[PDB]
Design a protein around this ligand. Sequence first.
Ligand SMILES: c1nc(N2CCOCC2)c2nc[nH]c2n1
Length: 246
Amino acid sequence: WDLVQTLGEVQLAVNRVTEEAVAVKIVDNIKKEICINKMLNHENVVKFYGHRREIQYLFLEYCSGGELFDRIEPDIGMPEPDAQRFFHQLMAGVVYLHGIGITHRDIKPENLLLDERDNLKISDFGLATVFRYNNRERLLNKMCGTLPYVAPELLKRREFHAEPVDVWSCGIVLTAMLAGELPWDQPSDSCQEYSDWKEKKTYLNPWKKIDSAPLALLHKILVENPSARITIPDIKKDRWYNKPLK
Ligand SMILES: c1nc(N2CCOCC2)c2nc[nH]c2n1
């Protein structure tokens, strides 16, 4: 395997005989990340091939599509139809992860990679952890992620359920896809932008730029009480989510 270039550490590696391409992760967490990656088998999660301990090398499906982040036009987002498709495949990824007791913990556009056909794949399990084992749920105490995408309970609680935090970060991604901007620096009362949302001031950016069907869903996802917040089974039955789009 020869490393043609740096992906953005991750570099593209092309096998000389086969000529097949891939992504190689070189890192000198990692033990957990490798362990969790070898559990995953889904068409919406970056594929794990193997690893070699020379400095550690991880062999991952290469997504020529690049980051979902680059498909978002600033201050504009992207065609509602494309966002819906991406969000559908994102739910598929997370349902799967959650179904095998795994939480990504850092869902964001930088970590949603697109393949040649543009199918979305969830990337980077360096922050991921088990939250269900032997059918026993474990609450999470550690703080992980990025501030704009983090659920508010993560800032306020000593302990919290894993699933609604991932759902919340998926709602922030949906907001970014349809408005081309992040709503708040962090999910806290001190923040003006977050208080404004809690007060339903949707006549402001970013909400101004979102049609009412998807906004109604964001209303159900960006709910401060992680217990009142919509769950993924419910998201599937959401009206916008099942709306035929051009
Ligand atoms: C395409 N792009 C990737 N990245 C984008 C740059 O940051 C690292 C992840 C990939 N990471 C693993 N496979 C990949 N295929």
